[PDB]
Amino acid sequence: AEAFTREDYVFMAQLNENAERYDEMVETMRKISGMEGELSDKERNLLSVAYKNVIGPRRAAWRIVSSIEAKEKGRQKPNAKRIEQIRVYRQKIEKELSDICNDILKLLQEQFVPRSTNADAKVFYYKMQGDYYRYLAEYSSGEDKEKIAGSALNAYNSAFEISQQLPPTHPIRLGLALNFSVFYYEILASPDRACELARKAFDAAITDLDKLTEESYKDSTLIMQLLRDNLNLWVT
Amino acid sequence: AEAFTREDYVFMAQLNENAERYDEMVETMRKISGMEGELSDKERNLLSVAYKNVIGPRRAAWRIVSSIEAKEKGRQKPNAKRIEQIRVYRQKIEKELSDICNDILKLLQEQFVPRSTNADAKVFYYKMQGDYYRYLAEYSSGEDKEKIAGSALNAYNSAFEISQQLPPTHPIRLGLALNFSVFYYEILASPDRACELARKAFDAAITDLDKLTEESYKDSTLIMQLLRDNLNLWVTD
C-alpha cells in the first residue's frame, strides 16, 4: 500500500548520478520517460546529464583513436594491419555513439516533444535533438552527414523559433545560441552565420545584463553596456 | 589478412588504456594471459592497470552510496522507502565488486602464480592476491570477512617473503609494503603492525636513496639521510 512514487525514481536518478554510474542513470530516466506526464525542469536536467555522461566518454575515446589512426596512416612506412586494428576499434565506438544518439533522438521525437505543452520545454527538447544529431554528424560523411546535418539544422531552427518567446538572458535560449553557432562553424561550414548568431544572442544578453546583476553592481553593469555600445557603433 | 599475434594484442591493450575503456582492456589482457608463457613486466602492468580501473570505480561508488546510507539512517525523519532503495543499490555494487575480485583472484591462483618462474613476478602476483582479497574484505561482514582476511594475510606474507630477495628500492617491494601496511591498518585494525611495516620499508629505502638519486643531487640525498638518522636517534629520548 506504500510502494514507490515518482519522487523515488527521481531519487535513483540522483543516486545513480552521485555514484557516477550513468548507464544506470539513463535507464532510471528512461523509466520516468515511460511514465505519464511531462518531465519537470529537474527531470529534464537529469535526462540531459545522464545522456551527456554516456555519450561524453565515447566521443573522447573516438577522438583519441581517430588521432592515433591519423598518425599510423601518415607514417613513412605504414602498417596496414595495425591501421585496420585501429580502424575497426573506431568503428566499434562509432556503433556505440549511433546507438546512444539514436536512442535519445527516438525518445525526443516519439515521446518528449509530442507530449510537451510548455514553450521553454519545447526549446530544450529541440535543442537536445539538434545536439545529438550534431554528434552523429561529427563522425559521419557523404549523404549520411548531409542528411544528419539537415535534421540537426531543423531541430535547432525549431528550437530557435520558439526561443524568441523566452527572455534573452534565459539559460536555454543562450545555450541554444551557443550550440547552434558551433553547429554552423564546425559542421555546416558557415562562419558568418556562426559569428552573427553568437554576436546577436550575446548582445541581447548584454542589454538585460542589469537583470543578472544585483543592484549593488548596477553601475558597473552599465559601463559594460556602454563599452559594448561604443564598440558596436564604431565599426560604423 | 593475417592472424593477430601477442604483439598485436598488447597494442590493443594499450589502445584500450588510451581510450580509458578498461572493460575491453581487461578482456584483451585476459586474451594475452591465455597465450604462451608468462606475462612480461610490461604486460603485468597492463594487467594491473586494467583491473584497478574496473574495480576502482565500483569502490568509489560503494563508498559514496555507503556514505549516503549513513546520512539517511541518521536523520531526524528517516525515509524507509530510500533506505531500502540505497541498500539494494549498495548490494548490486557489492556483487560487481565480488565478480571482478573472483575473476582476477581465480586467474592469479590458477594461472599466474602457478606458472610464475621469477621472484620478481611471484611477489607481484602474491601482492595482487592480497590486494583483491583486501577489496573483498573491505565490504565483507563479520564471520565471512575473517576467512577473506586470512587469504589476504596469507598472500601478503607470501609476497613479503619472496620480496626480501628484491632490493629495498624495488617498486614491487615498496608497493607491497605500502599495501600490506594498509591491510593491517584498515582491515585487521592493527595500527601497531601497520606503522612498523611502513616505517621499516620506508627507512630501508632512504638508506639506498643514493641509488635512486642522480649524480647531480647526491649531496641533497645525504643530508636527507642524515636528517632521518638524527630524527630516529632524537625521537628516542
Author numbering:
A (entry chain A): 2 to 237
B (entry chain B): 2 to 238
Reproduce the article's own wording on this structure:
The structure of the g14-3-3 was determined at 3.2 Å resolution in the P32 space group and the asymmetric unit contained two functional dimers. Each g14-3-3 monomer displayed the typical 14-3-3 structural organization with nine antiparallel α-helices (A-I) arranged in a ‘U’ shaped fashion with a large central binding groove. The g14-3-3 N-terminal dimerization relies on residues largely conserved among the 14-3-3 family members involving, in this case, three salt bridges between Arg22 and Glu97, Asp9 and Lys82, and Glu25 and Lys93. Indeed, helix I of g14-3-3, compared with the human isoforms, is rotated of about 180° around helix H implying a substantial rearrangement of the loop connecting helices H and I (HI loop). As consequence of the helix I rearrangement, the g14-3-3 structure showed a fully open “extended” conformation of the C-terminal region, supporting the notion that the g14-3-3 region encompassing helices G and I possesses a degree of flexibility allowing the binding groove to change from a “closed” to an “open” conformation and thus accommodating different types of peptides. A possible consequence of such exposure of hydrophobic residues is the observed domain swapping occurring between the C-terminus of two g14-3-3 monomers, each belonging to a different dimer, in which helix I' from a monomer interacts with helices F and H from the monomer of the neighboring dimer. Domain swapping entails a dimerization event at the protein C-terminus with the formation of a four-helix bundle between two adjacent g14-3-3 dimers, leading to the assemblage of protein filaments. The overall g14-3-3 crystal packing resulted in stacks of endless parallel filaments, each layer being rotated 60° with respect to the previous one. The observed “extended” conformation of g14-3-3 with the large conformational change of helix I would disrupt the binding groove, which is indeed restored by domain swapping of helix I', indicating that the protein assemblies can retain phosphopeptide binding properties even in the case of C-terminal dimerization. The solved structure of g14-3-3 is not phosphorylated and Thr214 is buried at the C-terminal interface and its side chain establishes a hydrogen bond with Thr222.
Eukaryotic 14-3-3s are a family of dimeric highly conserved proteins (∼30 kDa) with pSer/pThr binding property. 14-3-3s bind to hundreds of client proteins thus affecting many cellular processes, including metabolism, signal transduction, cell cycle, differentiation, apoptosis, protein trafficking, transcription, stress responses and malignant transformation. Giardia posseses a single 14-3-3 isoform (g14-3-3) showing high sequence identity to the 14-3-3s of the epsilon subgroup. Interestingly, two post-translational modifications (PTMs) make g14-3-3 unique in the 14-3-3 protein family: constitutive phosphorylation and polyglycylation.
